[PDB]
Amino acid sequence: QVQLQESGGGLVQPGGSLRLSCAASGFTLDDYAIGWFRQAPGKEREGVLCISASGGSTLYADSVKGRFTISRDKDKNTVYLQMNSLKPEDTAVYYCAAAGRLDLGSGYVCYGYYGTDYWGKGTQVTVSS
Amino acid sequence: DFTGCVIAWNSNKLDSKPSGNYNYLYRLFRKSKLKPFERDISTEIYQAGNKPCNGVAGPNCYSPLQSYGFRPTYGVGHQPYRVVVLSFELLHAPATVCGPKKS
Amino acid sequence: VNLITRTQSYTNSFTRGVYYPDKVFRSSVLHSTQDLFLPFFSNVTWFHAIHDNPALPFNDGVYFASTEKSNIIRGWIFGTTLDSKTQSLLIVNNATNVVIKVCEFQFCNDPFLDVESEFRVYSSANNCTFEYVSQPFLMKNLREFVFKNIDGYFKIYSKHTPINLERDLPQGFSALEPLVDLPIGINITRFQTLLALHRWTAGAAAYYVGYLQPRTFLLKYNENGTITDAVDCALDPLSETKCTLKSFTVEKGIYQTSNFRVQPTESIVRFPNITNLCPFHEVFNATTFASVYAWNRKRISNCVADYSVIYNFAPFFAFKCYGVSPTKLNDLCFTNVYADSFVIRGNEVSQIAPGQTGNIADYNYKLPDDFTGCVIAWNSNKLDSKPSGNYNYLYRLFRKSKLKPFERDISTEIYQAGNKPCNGVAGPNCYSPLQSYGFRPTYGVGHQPYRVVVLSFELLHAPATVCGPKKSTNLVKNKCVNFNFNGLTGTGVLTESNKKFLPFQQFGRDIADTTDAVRDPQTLEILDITPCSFGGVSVITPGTNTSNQVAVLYQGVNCTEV
Ligand SMILES: *[C@@H]1O[C@H](CO)[C@@H](O[C@@H]2O[C@H](CO)[C@@H](O)[C@H](O)[C@H]2NC(C)=O)[C@H](O)[C@H]1NC(C)=O
Ligand SMILES: *[C@@H]1O[C@H](CO)[C@@H](O)[C@H](O)[C@H]1NC(C)=O
Numbered sequence: 155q156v157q158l159q160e161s162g163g164g165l166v167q168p169g170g171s172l173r174l175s176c177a178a179s180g181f182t183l184d185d186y187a188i189g190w191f192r193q194a195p196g197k198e199r200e201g202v203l204c205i206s207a208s209g210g211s212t213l214y215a216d217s218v219k220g221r222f223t224i225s226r227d228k229d230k231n232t233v234y235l236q237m238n239s240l241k242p243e244d245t246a247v248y249y250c251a252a253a254g255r256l257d258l259g260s261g262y263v264c265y266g267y268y269g270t271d272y273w274g275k276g277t278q279v280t281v282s283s
Numbered sequence: 284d285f286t287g288c289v290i291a292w293n294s295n296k297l298d299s300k301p302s303g304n305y306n307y308l309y310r311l312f313r314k315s316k317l318k319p320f321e322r323d324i325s326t327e328i329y330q331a332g333n334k335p336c337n338g339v340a341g342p343n344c345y346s347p348l349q350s351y352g353f354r355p356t357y358g359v360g361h362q363p364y365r366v367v368v369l370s371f372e373l374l375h376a377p378a379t380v381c382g383p384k385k386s
Numbered sequence: 387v388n389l390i391t392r393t394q395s396y397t398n399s400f401t402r403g404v405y406y407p408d409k410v411f412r413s414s415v416l417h418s419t420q421d422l423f424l425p426f427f428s429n430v431t432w433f434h435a436i437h438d439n440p441a442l443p444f445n446d447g448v449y450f451a452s453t454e455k456s457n458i459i460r461g462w463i464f465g466t467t468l469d470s471k472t473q474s475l476l477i478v479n480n481a482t483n484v485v486i487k488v489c490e491f492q493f494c495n496d497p498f499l500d501v502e503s504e505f506r507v508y509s510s511a512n513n514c515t516f517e518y519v520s521q522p523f524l525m526k527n528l529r530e531f532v533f534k535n536i537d538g539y540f541k542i543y544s545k546h547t548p549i550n551l552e553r554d555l556p557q558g559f560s561a562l563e564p565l566v567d568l569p570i571g572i573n574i575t576r577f578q579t580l581l582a583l584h585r586w587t588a589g590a591a592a593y594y595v596g597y598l599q600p601r602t603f604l605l606k607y608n609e610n611g612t613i614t615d616a617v618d619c620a621l622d623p624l625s626e627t628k629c630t631l632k633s634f635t636v637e638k639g640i641y642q643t644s645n646f647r648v649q650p651t652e653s654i655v656r657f658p659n660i661t662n663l664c665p666f667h668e669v670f671n672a673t674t675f676a677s678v679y680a681w682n683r684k685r686i687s688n689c690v691a692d693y694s695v696i697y698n699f700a701p702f703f704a705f706k707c708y709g710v711s712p713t714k715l716n717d718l719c720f721t722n723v724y725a726d727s728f729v730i731r732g733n734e735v736s737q738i739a740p741g742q743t744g745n746i747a748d749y750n751y752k753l754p755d756d757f758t759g760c761v762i763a764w765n766s767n768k769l770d771s772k773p774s775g776n777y778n779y780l781y782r783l784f785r786k787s788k789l790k791p792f793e794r795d796i797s798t799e800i801y802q803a804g805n806k807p808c809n810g811v812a813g814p815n816c817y818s819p820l821q822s823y824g825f826r827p828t829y830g831v832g833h834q835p836y837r838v839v840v841l842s843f844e845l846l847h848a849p850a851t852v853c854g855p856k857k858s859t860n861l862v863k864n865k866c867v868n869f870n871f872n873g874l875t876g877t878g879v880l881t882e883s884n885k886k887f888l889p890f891q892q893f894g895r896d897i898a899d900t901t902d903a904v905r906d907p908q909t910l911e912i913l914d915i916t917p918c919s920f921g922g923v924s925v926i927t928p929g930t931n932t933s934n935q936v937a938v939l940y941q942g943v944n945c946t947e948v
Contacts, residue, residue, distance in 0.1 A: 181513075184324060184326050184348075185326060185348070208326075209338070228510075228512055229510050231512075231513060254305065254350075257308070257346055257348060257349055257350050259340065259703060259704045260329075260340060260344070260345035260346045260704065261328070261340025261344070261345070261346050262326075262328065262340060262346055262348075263340070311711075320538065320571075321538075321571070324473075325471070325472060331713050345713075358741070358755075375408075375409065376409060376567075
């Protein structure tokens with residue numbers, strides 16, 4: 155019922171701009187924190203960035219701060235990102251993921267990292283360098 | 284004044300995972316009780332203090348949505364259960380549902 | 387865009403709005419029914435709209451009556467908040483159709499149609515939950531509609547009647563007939579009317595709106611089965627007489643209708659005489675903690691416990707209660723309170739839970755599976771850690787059998803895991819089941835020492851002794867009052883007393899074995915109880931064919947209270 159399909163990617167020169175989106179179909183959880191991950195060949199998969207589903211409390215990573223601009227649209231229930239100023243260190247296999255939020259201490263807190271319920275098929279983003 | 288049939292079966296074989304199943308949640312706090320056969324999906328930070336919560340779960344700020352914990356090693360009362368209930372509307376309008384009685 | 391303005395006048399409803407309550411057929415029968423209706427001579431708010439707060443409340447049910455001919459009145463939108471936070475309906479009634487969309491649609495200022503886009507009504511919502519359609523054949527005259535929602539069921543009644551050239555609602559009656567039912571099932575607290583404005587252009591309209599209430603009516607069916615008369619049962623004493631006698635005419639005489647009572651105003655309650663304060667300061671902080679294998683247990687009773695000050699004694703984050711809630715500990719009254727305090731390792735806090743398994747769970751502290759209480763654990767890295775290494779805290783490692791619930795071990799001996807006896811020497815197959823905890827300020831989070839306090843409560847099995855200090859409602863006097871005194875539900879008038887209750891009586895009854903003199907568990911006072919005054923009502927009328935004037939008499943009551 156819940157499926158995550160991802161579209162976009164390709165090979166571009168360093169410093170270029172790319173738009174990549176993952177669409178969630180059949181999602182039913184009221185509170186959730188969809189996660190985003192990438193894995194270069196020979197390195198472990200790590201989180202990239204995420205925002206809150208309720209209001210859009212944004213969060214980034216140190217390596218991709220500012221460069222990776224994200225926005226979540228509830229109309230199509232999909233996640234959109236603007237990626238500019240590409241460097242060779244960004245060459246990795248990007249996977250889109252969805253997971254439920256944590257309920258501890260009687261609060262609504264969005265968490266990423268590991269422990270993700272669902273994942274996408276992924277794509278390849280290549281920088282010519 | 285309930286009239287109808289209830290069928291309950293333990294589903295610990297499919298709703299339990301080794302890591303622990305949090306698929307299901309329940310509301311723990313509510314200002315007023317629920318009318319019969321009414322649900323509640325709206326999610327917000329419950330406020331238990333004079334000061335407004337302002338969307339931050341700090342002091343006197345709670346979440347009225349607690350996740351269940353389902354595991355296959357838990358007790359029988361802690362095992363997940365699947366329930367199907369059938370309720371009937373009796374003859375007040377032209378009846379629509381009944382078995383294959385030959386005219 | 388705000389471009390519609392409105393004015394309000396008021397009118398009396400006269401006697402309109404009787405609809406066939408059921409799907410049944412009757413003839414020449416005076417029937418009685420209880421349901422939602424528009425009370426006779428109600429206060430209808432005439433709306434005159436020209437071209438605004440069009441968020442008209444819905445309440446239980448709405449009666450909508452119009453007299454316009456241009457068909458400029460069309461559609462009716464219903465909802466609770468009409469925003470993107472709570473689900474809202476989208477009933478949009480047009481020429482010959484009806485459609486429903488129910489989810490968290492947001493709504494603007496003027497819910498109008500451009501004319502035919504409903505974009506000015508809703509924009510978006512999370513994957514909408516439901517969409518429905520239906521197809522009617524909808525069509526100097528008065529058009530009357532009644533909409534109601536019962537048990538998640540929306541029902542509509544209608545009637546088109548001819549009226550001569552007149553300015554207000556007419557006399558006579560008009561039965562209403564049903565058209566449509568559908569189970570939406572939500573809280574609708576407001577609704578909105580809609581019109582047609584062509585681009586725009588000036589517009590004029592007028593209509594009447596009334597709010598239904600639950601009532602009891604008596605209806606008269608003619609020989610043809612059509613309703614031709616109806617009488618309310620809560621309007622005038624003459625109407626009450628008509629309802630009681632089940633007839634439309636009352637002969638000369640005196641009849642009895644019902645009874646009147648003094649409805650008590652407020653409510654009051656009881657609490658016992660507790661003035662002590664429970665000592666939470668000594669338990670939560672004593673500059674020293676007992677070991678986990680020998681946990682310190684204290685009993686607290688015969689005092690008032692203020693659990694709001696617990697946060698100010700220990701630097702923890704939040705409570706962890708199973709049988710009760712952290713915010714619901716100042717209301718329930720318990721018999722005894724048990725507090726068990728110790729210090730454990732950082733990662734073994736997870737083992738402090740009902741039905742836990744582990745070294746601590748079955749060797750140091752065991753808890754019955756039906757635990758009804760709370761557990762508070764918080765770090766102790768600044769007091770229980772030393773640069774050399776703390777060694778004053780020990781935990782049991784080896785035990786022959788798992789610990790029973792609420793059981794401790796204090797005995798120290800040499801554990802034997804071999805066939806040969808230990809003989810008091812820790813040689814081969816001889817161990818010491820007491821391992822000293824290693825606490826350092828450079829250790830990881832899961833290894834930091836943590837103070838743990840488990841509070842266990844006892845339910846109402848004996849006279850309770852621990853609960854919050856709420857007064858017994860500051861005992862009122864000389865008023866008919868509701869009350870729940872110690873589980874006794876009732877009403878009565880409370881006055882002073884002149885009877886000598888002996889030192890330790892709580893309730894004192896009468897010949898009827900019902901209480902008449904009473905004490906107070908918060909202050910030793912003697913009080914008297916009387917029933918609130920009540921009586922019967924009689925109505926004296928001449929013949930109905932003579933006049934409609936009536937006289938009302940209250941039986942056996944002095945002419946001062948009434
Ligand atoms: C019933 O209708 C009358 C109109 O006949 C309304 O007038 C209100 O009257 C009360 C008491 O005189 C005032 O306090 C309100 O301010 C009036 N409302 C206005 C001026 O808009 C009113 O809706 C009802 N009157 C009642 C219940 O006494
Ligand atoms: C409907 O909305 C009101 C308005 O906030 C809310 O108080 C209520 O709990 C909701 N449900 C019912 C059944 O009234």
